[PDB]
Design an enzyme around this catalytic site. Sequence first.
Site, PDB file in Angstrom:
ATOM      1  N   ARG A 151     -32.212  -7.749   0.255  1.00 22.01           N
ATOM      2  CA  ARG A 151     -32.553  -6.369   0.429  1.00 22.01           C
ATOM      3  C   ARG A 151     -34.017  -5.997   0.009  1.00 22.01           C
ATOM      4  NH1 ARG A 151     -27.561  -6.906  -0.787  1.00 22.01           N
ATOM      5  NH2 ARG A 151     -25.896  -5.211  -0.230  1.00 22.01           N
ATOM      6  N   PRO A 328     -13.615 -17.624  17.608  1.00 24.45           N
ATOM      7  CA  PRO A 328     -12.679 -17.798  18.492  1.00 24.45           C
ATOM      8  C   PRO A 328     -12.728 -16.272  19.242  1.00 24.45           C
ATOM      9  CG  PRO A 328     -11.654 -18.324  16.280  1.00 24.45           C
ATOM     10  CD  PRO A 328     -13.347 -18.093  16.104  1.00 24.45           C
ATOM     11  N   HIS A 356      -3.487 -13.855  16.798  1.00 22.70           N
ATOM     12  CA  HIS A 356      -4.374 -12.473  16.995  1.00 22.70           C
ATOM     13  C   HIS A 356      -5.390 -12.611  18.288  1.00 22.70           C
ATOM     14  CE1 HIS A 356      -7.641  -9.813  15.605  1.00 22.70           C
ATOM     15  NE2 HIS A 356      -8.147 -10.142  16.608  1.00 22.70           N
ATOM     16  N   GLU A 357      -5.849 -13.544  19.040  1.00 24.64           N
ATOM     17  CA  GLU A 357      -6.506 -13.519  20.139  1.00 24.64           C
ATOM     18  C   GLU A 357      -5.459 -13.517  21.159  1.00 24.64           C
ATOM     19  OE1 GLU A 357      -9.717 -13.194  19.484  1.00 24.64           O
ATOM     20  OE2 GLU A 357      -9.899 -13.751  17.287  1.00 24.64           O
ATOM     21  N   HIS A 360      -5.112  -9.959  21.986  1.00 20.94           N
ATOM     22  CA  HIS A 360      -6.039  -9.548  22.896  1.00 20.94           C
ATOM     23  C   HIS A 360      -5.750  -9.655  24.361  1.00 20.94           C
ATOM     24  CE1 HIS A 360      -8.675  -8.170  19.606  1.00 20.94           C
ATOM     25  NE2 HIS A 360      -8.879  -9.509  19.160  1.00 20.94           N
ATOM     26  N   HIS A 487     -24.364  -4.886  11.249  1.00 17.34           N
ATOM     27  CA  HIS A 487     -23.945  -3.662  12.197  1.00 17.34           C
ATOM     28  C   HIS A 487     -24.816  -2.541  12.079  1.00 17.34           C
ATOM     29  CE1 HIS A 487     -19.725  -5.428  12.392  1.00 17.34           C
ATOM     30  NE2 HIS A 487     -20.263  -5.932  11.265  1.00 17.34           N
TER      31      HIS A 487
END
Lengths: 597, 174
Positions: A151, A328, A356-357, A360, A487
């Site tokens: 930081r 992934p 999970h994938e 999608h 982000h």
Amino acid sequence: STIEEQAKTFLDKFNHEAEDLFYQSSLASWNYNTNITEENVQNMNNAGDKWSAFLKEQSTLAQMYPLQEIQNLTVKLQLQALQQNGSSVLSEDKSKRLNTILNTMSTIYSTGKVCNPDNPQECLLLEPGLNEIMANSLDYNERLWAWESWRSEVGKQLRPLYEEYVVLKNEMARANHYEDYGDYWRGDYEVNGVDGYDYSRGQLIEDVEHTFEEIKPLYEHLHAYVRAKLMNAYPSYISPIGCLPAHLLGDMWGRFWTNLYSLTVPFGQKPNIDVTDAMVDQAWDAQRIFKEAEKFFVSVGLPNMTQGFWENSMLTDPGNVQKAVCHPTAWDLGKGDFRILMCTKVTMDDFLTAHHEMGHIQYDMAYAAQPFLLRNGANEGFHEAVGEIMSLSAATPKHLKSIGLLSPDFQEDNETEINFLLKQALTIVGTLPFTYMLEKWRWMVFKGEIPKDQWMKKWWEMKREIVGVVEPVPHDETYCDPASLFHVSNDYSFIRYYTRTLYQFQFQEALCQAAKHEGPLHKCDISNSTEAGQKLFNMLRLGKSEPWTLALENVVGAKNMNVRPLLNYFEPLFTWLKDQNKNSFVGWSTDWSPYAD
Amino acid sequence: CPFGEVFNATKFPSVYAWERKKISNCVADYSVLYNSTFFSTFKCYGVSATKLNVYADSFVVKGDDVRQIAPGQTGVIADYNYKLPDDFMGCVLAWNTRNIDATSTGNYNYKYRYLRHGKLRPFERDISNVPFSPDGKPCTPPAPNCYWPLRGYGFYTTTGIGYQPYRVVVLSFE
Ligand SMILES: [Cl-]
Ligand SMILES: [Zn+2]
């Protein structure tokens, strides 16, 4: 004829051109992520450039047909979408400059490494090494240093860039008729037209704040418990009533308290709902893992993976010679081409990841009958929520049992369950406040409510107010911490991370009711249940097509974001914390500081 | 009898510019195609027998477009390229030609028509590559509201079956 009918003819040309050109961008981008060469990394730009151009061209080309003169809801949606001046509504330089800004921030971040204050020959990068510290180190100072180095280096460097960033980006925002860049983002959840399903850019702020309220009790209690446990690991550094020192939270920012499990585990003497050992012992390969997942979906009424999925996917690491990226990913190249890229290892983790994938992918197919511009989860957070529902059912011992990876006669245990629950809170619940405060500060620095000189004075007023975290060292405007987080300094709306969390619980809840579930909501597996599937696939086959509020209705019977299913998931835990916190203090003092002396 | 020349032939036409082969006189058995799972459609709209006694149209379409070479039927292919009368009929055979008509690099020779004023009357044809405008006006592409009505498929070997190349042969009876 009519500007409406002649606009239909426009989209009908676009969809046809997009399909083809998008596929070329995908195929190239694919060759690259699986065969990192120079010739391959070359095409990955070319087709990816034809794309960016094509969109820009098709955007301005659509900036003709007057949105104002249309009555067909869909065509209105599609046009609205295509009409993104965005970057091209500014001056000649003002745009190119914003890009220089955006671009350098991304690169100073990804590149920035910090050097040992005493050993300048070794210097660590954020990943790994630096994040390796925040994740494992039990040394108060070693942690304290990493947290501050980062930081302090990239922190500062980003302060000027961000300074200007917030201006140009805001200039752009108000230029498109948005109250500010913050209004631009909240826009994603906006819906106009179908009544009883509308949603206004401000409604988000209200609904997020109103909902965050009901999380507080649960959180404060998780907080109180984690604190007391931390006090033990870091004796004398923590206050029994003070906030928690940002650098002791498990990762660089404290986005997730996942890594804190080690020292917060309720009953350390319990063990391993980890079948990694079991899979390895029964000679399971990638194939089996993926075939097994395919079965799970077919079990609820969803289609076998396409022939070209088994045919064109890469489920294993090519090893030597052929180098490939491993994050992934679930690919929707279009043209009916669906693929998964994953360097599968035989772990319970990759096993869950694969469910999970493949979620999608299963979403991608459901809405593939929609017109190009409508193929995509309702809002930013729908796709993630779906992928997460799967790993949620597949994780149950019930499922691990019926699949033959967990011993046929193994028992529950109300203790091993409180453990699992906490492991989850540490991640799912710990992030929420953090995520919600991050975007609040970010929103305000867009409504202009924070003076350039109170940027860190107002950052930490809030980390202490909302999240219950204090800085180890005081930070003036020489810093810019709410930017050392990917982000932020890589331009991404963070709030999705919060809604998707809620959503994903409202989903799993309906789907357990829907599949008639007996026990507590968290032990639920939705397998073998075609009944639930039907209901899922109801909002799946829509894609961006209907308003997101409608879409939610389809699975949870409500027009809105409700947090009670998230608390229900954490009720056996929530009450259990209220007992631990029996003699602990619950809440905090914004005033206390680690450094003070 | 001269069926070899039809479906065993090398190059197939695009849908919009389909071929009609005239077969009279000679006698064929029908056991040529009867016995063969090579085909993926083989739907007939009238019968399914023999009598040792005829028009054969051929073209190539996307997978999902095969359902349109049948009576009635939605649009695009059936509306602008090939139309079967709700009435009259024989058979409609198709087979996947992903090996032949699709390359891993992308094959865009086969074309189709997606814009046209009106629908085709059954067995009608249109090889009119003239810049389209939703109002009759002439067109000077790149003028806005001007699009070429003829587009290429783009048959990659890696698409889903719905997007792979299929060869069609409509057998009309007279
Ligand atoms: Cl921070
Ligand atoms: Zn995902």
